[PDB]
Amino acid sequence: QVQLQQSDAELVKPGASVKISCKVSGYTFTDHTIHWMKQRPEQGLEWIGYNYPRDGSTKYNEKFKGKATLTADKSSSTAYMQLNSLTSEDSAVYFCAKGFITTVVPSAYWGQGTLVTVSSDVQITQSPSYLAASPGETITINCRASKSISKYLAWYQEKPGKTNKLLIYSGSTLQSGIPSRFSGSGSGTDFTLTISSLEPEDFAMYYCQQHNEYPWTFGGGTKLEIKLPETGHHHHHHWSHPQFEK
Amino acid sequence: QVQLQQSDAELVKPGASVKISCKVSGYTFTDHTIHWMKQRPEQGLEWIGYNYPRDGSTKYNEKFKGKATLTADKSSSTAYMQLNSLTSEDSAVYFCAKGFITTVVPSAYWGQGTLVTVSAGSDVQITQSPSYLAASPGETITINCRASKSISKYLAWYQEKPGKTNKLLIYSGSTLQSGIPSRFSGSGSGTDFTLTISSLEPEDFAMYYCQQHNEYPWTFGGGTKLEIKLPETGHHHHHHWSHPQ
Amino acid sequence: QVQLQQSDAELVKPGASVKISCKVSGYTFTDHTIHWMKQRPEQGLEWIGYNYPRDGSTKYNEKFKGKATLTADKSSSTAYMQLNSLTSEDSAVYFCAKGFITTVVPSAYWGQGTLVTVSAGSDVQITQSPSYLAASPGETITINCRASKSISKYLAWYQEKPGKTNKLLIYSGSTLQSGIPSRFSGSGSGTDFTLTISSLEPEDFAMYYCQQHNEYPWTFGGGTKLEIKLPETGHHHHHHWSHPQ
Amino acid sequence: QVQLQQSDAELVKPGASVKISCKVSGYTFTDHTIHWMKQRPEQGLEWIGYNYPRDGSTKYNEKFKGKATLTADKSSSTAYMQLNSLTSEDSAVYFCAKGFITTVVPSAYWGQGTLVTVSSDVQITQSPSYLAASPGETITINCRASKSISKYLAWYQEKPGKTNKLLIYSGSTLQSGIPSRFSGSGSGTDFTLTISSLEPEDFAMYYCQQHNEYPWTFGGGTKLEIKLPETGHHHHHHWSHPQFEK
Ligand SMILES: [Co+2]
Ligand SMILES: [Co+2]
Ligand SMILES: [Co+2]
Ligand SMILES: [Co+2]
Ligand SMILES: [Co+2]
Ligand SMILES: [Co+2]
Ligand SMILES: [Co+2]
Ligand SMILES: [Co+2]
Fold first, then answer.
1. Which domains are assigned to chain C?
2. CA distances, D109 to each of D19, D98, D163, D164, D240 (Å)
3. How far is C239 from chain A (nearest CA, A)?
């Protein structure tokens, strides 16, 4: 029961700052970095940087240097990110996640996100971007890296109302607690995620992430939809990217 | 310069018959079988049977006997299929295709199809997935195909583009048909197969079908549509999910 | 023997430019304008602008200035469109088309289109309906088109079939383009128009678009897909309906 | 408030008979014929015949002679149809409807149907058979008759959970109580129904019917679906042909 509780949605004017928070419980706060991520529907997931609470050190993705300031308060087990000189391009959902010590290791423990509304790197190509199939069938998602990342590709399942779930890391090792019908493959630049015996729960956003070097970089995302055959009885509901779910 | 020239579309009343034709040129007619397939548009493909012109032998998909009668006229190098007691469920596109008398592997030469409009058990089941997928030129996608019992390696893949005859991409799981670009590849054995297209080109966006050619009747997957992706918008939109009962 | 020969598909990174070309043959190049259109596949068509080669004049859809620059080279009878500061929303098919220097009515001669892939106010609004419809060869269907303000009679209709250039069916509401079969007819005036196809033939199943040519910028309906009907089954199946909030 | 209350669904073995009933209220029973119709999803609407309660006379469509027997009981204002020598082709929904005296006039007052499960005429081509459009837009349905029916074509809206609704009769005259955005046109063999300012209520089965001569004959039917744009919020539900709604 590692929980990251993020602060309420923010609606700010252009040019202002916002400081959003991340309250951690269920492990010793000072033992691991806190990572911060930005997500927009069009641009996907981006890594802003990490902050190490024990020591107060930070590492920033060059693209977010200056834009973001990461701090931590050891007494409250709370991490903060302040965004300054806000513009409409800063409108997104921002996530915090527990890292392992100060490693490149991807996080399996993400916060729920905070919506902010203003009013030589590894590039990864993810495909297909949208996919439809049936319960019981098997589908495959591809991710191609712009340079060799060895075997260090992770896969996430992002479902509405749940925090981001780590499926696979290091290319093919199945995360604890994930069903074996999830499997990953590849090394160097060409990777795949295969989901077999599809079930209705599997509708979600899927993302790959290289964890071979900083900055962390993500694929553009894949949306998976599941049939029901119109011969049977069922329901049709709606879900959206987290930015519109908030 | 191979033609399988098929007769024009038919618009007939229920209860009638039609005799559609398949005029072959560019190889020895009596040295090869003619296979016949039924498709309802965009949807599932089925194998009707084959006719061997030299001796007049026919083999039918059990489900199509009585419905179809296959004959050939050796003098004109034309093969025929007669459909009788037509009903609305007979409304479909019907294809002829050159058969090989040496392998189980299907041929790369199909007719353009004939449209028929009616108005006024231990077979291998093939499941294809995903049924639709969106990507961009330059990217890589992979299509899955599963057989209900082992077909060893004998799985073929086809690309259907409108206004062109069916294009054989792969047969026997991984062997590339002559003339097919190397960005296509297939793999699998027994029951689990995949077709992978890398560095997609604008022409690869199309319909795809797998087909086991390990035993008769030949059976096909339901089809996969590869469409050009639309960009994720920045405005409030919704997606769908479902659950039974 | 008219060609509008368009350059090959582009796969470019965001922020780059592309210069796509349109090589005309079969009529006097400098005696006619070149119009340019953007389409995202299957979806909405937009008019970018025109270029007159003899004097170099250009007229832009206000929404596309800065995005597009139209030029022509009279010596090679080639017209060009340069797109700059490319973004993913620029990913589309771009068409050139012969313009008339005498009427407002559009021409029947389009290029085949060029695909561009980017990765790694008082205008007349045109609403087309139904967006999809199913029928059978031999039957009759009619497509509606409504303009947000009066366009008098100046409405055109196009048939888009894959692998063929855009086909002009009707212009000015009811006038049949040369060579178009009489089972096509259009009617309407002001804001309410229809295209009616009787005795449908297998080739008429396609995408259709209306376009007002009464004022610039030229604007298009969203498109209508005419598909072959599937037969009503005798087994328990479900249909859908919806309601807001 | 003319009501036709039909008896409960029947499930019979092949070769048996069934007698289904039709209890009328809201007008004088003996003043008008009772029409009986058969509906299957594939074959559409068919006219079996009518029975005149005042006099006990019957008129049958030749195709149903022998198969159906129509009777009426004046004391109970109930009409009956007995189906004999049942086969699986007899499985359908059967409707009764109030006629006007003993005329060809189409009915605006239909019963809800009874589902039965076994375990030189004017032919009309209706097209399109399926149609999708948006609120506010306008659509057009065609019906072509095999011989001249003058102006005598009617249009019905069949919505799940409602009895069949008469929209237009005599080609173009709008039935009382129907909105003016419904309109019909044509004479001889070529007819159209036009629905403008489409609203979500308009999803239904639509059928044309010639009322120029007996036997009454119907078009094959058109299914109309209405968008909602996925940009807004809405619900998706299911409906079916009456045979599966029962
Ligand atoms: Co459904
Ligand atoms: Co539900
Ligand atoms: Co919403
Ligand atoms: Co989306
Ligand atoms: Co249905
Ligand atoms: Co929806
Ligand atoms: Co509801
Ligand atoms: Co049901």
1. 3-118 (2.60.40.10), 126-228 (2.60.40.10)
2. 21, 6, 8, 8, 21
3. 8
